[PDB]
Amino acid sequence: SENSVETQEITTFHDVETPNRIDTPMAQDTSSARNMDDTHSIIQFLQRPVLIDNIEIIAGTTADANKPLSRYVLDQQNSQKYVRSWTLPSTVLRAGGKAQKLANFKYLRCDVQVKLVLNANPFVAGRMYLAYSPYDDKVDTARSVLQTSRAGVTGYPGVELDFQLDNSVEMTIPYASFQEAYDLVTGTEDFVQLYLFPITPVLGPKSESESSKVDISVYMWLSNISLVIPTYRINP
Amino acid sequence: SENSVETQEITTFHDVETPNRIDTPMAQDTSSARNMDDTHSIIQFLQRPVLIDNIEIIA
Amino acid sequence: SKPRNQQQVCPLQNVPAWGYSLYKGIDMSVPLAYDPNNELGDLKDVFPSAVDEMAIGYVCGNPAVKHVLTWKTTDAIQKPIANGDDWGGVIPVGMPCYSKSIRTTRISATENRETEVMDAAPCEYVANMFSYWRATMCYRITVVKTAFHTGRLEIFFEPGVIPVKPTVNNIGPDQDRLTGAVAPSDNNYKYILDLTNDTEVTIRVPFVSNKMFLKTAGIYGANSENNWNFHESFSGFLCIRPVTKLMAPDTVSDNVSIVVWKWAEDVVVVEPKPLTSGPTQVYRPPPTASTAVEVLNVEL
Amino acid sequence: SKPRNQQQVCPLQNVPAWGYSLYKGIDMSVPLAYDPNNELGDLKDVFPSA
Amino acid sequence: INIGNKTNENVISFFDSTDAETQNHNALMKGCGEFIVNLRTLLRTFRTITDNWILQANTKTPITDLTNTTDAQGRDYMSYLSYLYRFYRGGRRYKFFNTTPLKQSQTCYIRSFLIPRNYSADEINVDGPSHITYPVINPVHEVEVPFYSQYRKIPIASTSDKGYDSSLMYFSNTATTQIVARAGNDDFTFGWMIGPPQLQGESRSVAP
């Protein structure tokens, strides 16, 4: 009669009395959408793998995709040559429609998974290396992966990427930032910044009209997430 | 909440509620005037002899 | 009976007053007294309280009025009270200061001195000493109404960057961005008070913003030039904007008052030095407006 | 919590290397090493006599 | 619903993840180490109240020629918490750091004595509990004034009564400019809390 303080998700009210609320006579169950699928939570929804990139290699090669790793890097013009650059988590959040499903939240504590499905013919050899380097375009110039030697590139954490032995890799890129719980509104996140390096050049028969392809693909999804503070904004 | 009738020496009040009275956090004792003399009541004070008259006789 | 010395050579460094800025450790200050065991008594019968009156749990637990609002029938709904306060409806959650008044005197025919004068809540006044803070804030919003004023009033949190207006000498909030229908209040933590018979509310806001400690700069040197420290000091703002307009008859007055109290519980601090670009100068009010205040400088 | 000093005045004589020509007594020579507890082994397997 | 008013006090809370007192230990153990609790502990640290105090040679100088000036500013912790309180008890430790261009044709030394508060120079004697240092061999003067008072506590800036507790007199021989730092002694504490006065910000003094 005096105490009407009820609680919604994140919302509380303050009335004089309980305002004479009427409702359903009996809450009988109806159409069977509950019996067709269980409800997917928002921590369950940010664990779906997405098709991000589709990298094709031909050897070849006129392009930069088969320049091998330099044994020495003597100057910043002749930096280390790579394939692609994924600037996590700003790539994994925008793709797959995730950012239009974690809107109206503020802080995030994620761990990015990376999987490489690989599919090449038996008549082609080679080897790559999938290194990640946190703050790789924030730290001073000499400390980045793109300026060190071949022994220094491979010494970074990662996994071997041989063709005939590995058709799938599982790498767990950790929560690797100094700030507690990544900001989203006015976001400049870009903490861990991934790379893909070829160690040996891709090898095939030197006669052409043969089409020695590689066709890498990249899957990423989050893990061990905690999504906490509600807001009204978001970056587009 | 309804019954605020308090009593002073010879004086009584009548309010709607007890008017949200705040007071000292802890009533710690202070300077020692209580330790120097006991309090003299008004029945104790009207028992002090007074020098009224001073009568001199010469023969 | 007079043997030779058996002790090793004690090494040495000549440091008079080694580590004087620490509250622990035996200090070599000579007492100018009769007894080396000079012991004052305990705290019995001296101060007329029994509460330990210096713990930060009690000093910062002291309520102070910050804002006095005037909520009118002229003012619209779903829009905070913009009154020339200038903060008013947008109270920044956080322990250090956020407001300032500027005193403009004259020196020559074309030169003036603009001295920033700040108000000081006791939660604010302690935080000026220390550099980095972390505290669970509190606010006790009270409506000063009659028996006949009703309505519904909303207070909602928002974490992060506060909307501002940088000026030449001060920062004002921006009520162009908090109106509408351009900034909804449907996903924030909120409380919808009722002016029918409920009057007061205390809205405890714990500390959550992506860092272990914020800064205690606040509004010192906050202007168009230097306003990084103002953003990294609060974890957002409360916002008092009305859901439903004030319903008042012609007998009672159309103006009600909203008094915003402030304190901070569970306070912890980091360094015993001021983070500001100036010493802790306490503002002494001049007798006459033509007189100026002595300024502490940074040479040694 | 920060009381006054209770120790007496320690008397003093400035003698660097007091009694250096004695085979006993702890000497103040600074080792130019990584570990203060720099301990060579015993005389086992070094000199080919026992 | 009737025409009237109630109080019905509501301590309603926002974010309620964990207990607050538990996270504050975990936050300071990785960011501070030191856990500041009581402001009584900040009256034990010697913060420098002046940077330069050019004392004229051969003059018994009371520190109240500097204390009346430097209790206004609140630069240290004694005069900054002189505004949040009203009373105080306990003695004031003083340290004096020499910064003089010393001269070899003299023997520089430093004395110290006691006066009761707010007396002038000549109206007190000199035989009392003393201390002496020699700044050629010891640049720091390590002096603690005790608490010898008539009253159990002292309010700030009192009435026409004077000489009701003791403080320092500072005697030298040469024109020694110094640094002065201070804090209260082991049993120095304030009391009787009030609300705080204002603060003063930056004074950049733009022309228009």
PDB file of C-alpha atoms in Angstrom, chain B residues 24-31, chain C residues 43-50:
ATOM      1  CA  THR B  24      25.668  14.871  19.954  1.00  0.00           C
ATOM      2  CA  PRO B  25      27.373  11.755  18.473  1.00  0.00           C
ATOM      3  CA  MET B  26      28.727  10.671  21.887  1.00  0.00           C
ATOM      4  CA  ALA B  27      28.280  12.700  25.087  1.00  0.00           C
ATOM      5  CA  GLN B  28      31.901  12.662  26.235  1.00  0.00           C
ATOM      6  CA  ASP B  29      32.673  14.367  29.554  1.00  0.00           C
ATOM      7  CA  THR B  30      34.666  17.620  29.443  1.00  0.00           C
ATOM      8  CA  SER B  31      36.183  20.215  31.886  1.00  0.00           C
TER       9      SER B  31
ATOM     10  CA  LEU C  43      41.625  10.961  23.447  1.00  0.00           C
ATOM     11  CA  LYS C  44      39.447  10.736  26.573  1.00  0.00           C
ATOM     12  CA  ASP C  45      37.505  13.835  27.738  1.00  0.00           C
ATOM     13  CA  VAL C  46      39.221  16.187  25.279  1.00  0.00           C
ATOM     14  CA  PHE C  47      37.134  16.397  22.167  1.00  0.00           C
ATOM     15  CA  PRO C  48      33.427  16.276  23.062  1.00  0.00           C
ATOM     16  CA  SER C  49      32.705  13.513  20.508  1.00  0.00           C
ATOM     17  CA  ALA C  50      33.484   9.809  20.738  1.00  0.00           C
TER      18      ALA C  50
END
